[model samples]
Target: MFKAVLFDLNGVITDTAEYHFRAWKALAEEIGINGVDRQFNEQLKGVSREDSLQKILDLADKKVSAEEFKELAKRKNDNYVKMIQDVSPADVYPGILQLLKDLRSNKIKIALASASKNGPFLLERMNLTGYFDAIADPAEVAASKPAPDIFIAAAHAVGVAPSESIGLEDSQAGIQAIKDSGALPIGVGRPEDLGDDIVIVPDTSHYTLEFLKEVWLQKQ
Candidate 1:
């Protein structure tokens, strides 16, 4: 049996990605970067705010002083924080609360490996803070998703071997990180987005511990 389950915070736990997109797009517009559409927002997923901003800057063919870049990131974060302050348990993805309860009852450890620095704050706002055994701090990690650093750190925090863990993620980078960490990667979005080979469900509503165990056994 898998000893632990790791989750990504943005798209998996809640739809904070929308809040981020709003904040980011607002920042982009403020800087005269047009065409900050939903499709472009996809590039920001599972990446650091600095990296996301860099991408936007690259698209705009704009450069700024180091301090100015820091200020832009701070402004975006402030907007995102305000937007997420209204989140409650009701904002949790469909069936995810039940999944957490089932995992706790089954004694499967839970950890969060997310790129967002405000992961813990959002979890608290959603009243789901008590569900996580550890929230791997992105700031403490050497790199972001696709690096395996965060997931590896989360597995270590929970005292579980990465090979004995299951990681759920909604971004390709997060999925790659999970695979590189030696954990089973369960993609939380459509197969079209995550690729056909990876195990995927359309949304959180479809997950159950029993179903996941079956998938784990099949993979083995």
Candidate 2:
């Protein structure tokens, strides 16, 4: 039913969230921002580094000049990049390889609509570059999650219409972006966390080409 599928990097493909969490935690500690825990990290998902930094600042009831904020964001990203240097195919979520294989064999296109600027690098590290038809650069997009810009760009990159694509996302913001982009939204987390009435899987392990096609056809 859909010509292509758009994927988010952190939660949908792999648990890069672990590195992101550690990065944010380290940044928070360095800046004296308390309460940087697992639960709090959820809010940072599907968001840009700048937005994540802003959230951390909000949590601390703190404010900084634009220069300082940029510095902090860059520092956090540097730490994250270092931590992810060891990423490999072993880091991919369960069932993802099978799902990618199925999609490829079935002639479905794939693209990355990730918020992370390091998406290409991560994919290369995971040895998944060949699985993707395109990667919409977050920096090239006008806006982040909840805006639909990145998703639309990704679908465009693969020469598919937004209405002919499916977006897999784990964050509410990303789900909103998918819906707003006119693509079918497949939630990769709990219904409560992702939203109600969307085609949701508990985790990436549930992502299968056949199952996704069924949902796409049913929705259409």
TM-score against truth, every candidate: 0.89, 0.89
lDDT (CA) per prediction: 0.90, 0.90
* C-alpha lDDT of residue 149 in model 1: 96
- What digit string (tens of lDDT, one per residue) describes model 1 on residues 7-93? 998788888878989999999888899878899998887667899999999997988999999999999988888888888888899
The alpha-carbon lDDT assigned to residue 140 of candidate 1 equals 97
Model 2 lDDT vs. the true structure? Answer: 0.90
lDDT of 2 by residue, 58-170 (tens): 99689899999889999998899899999999999988889888899988999999988789988998999999999999999877789999999999999999999999998
Query: What does the lDDT read for residue 29 in candidate 2?
Result: 94
Residue clash pairs of candidate 1? none
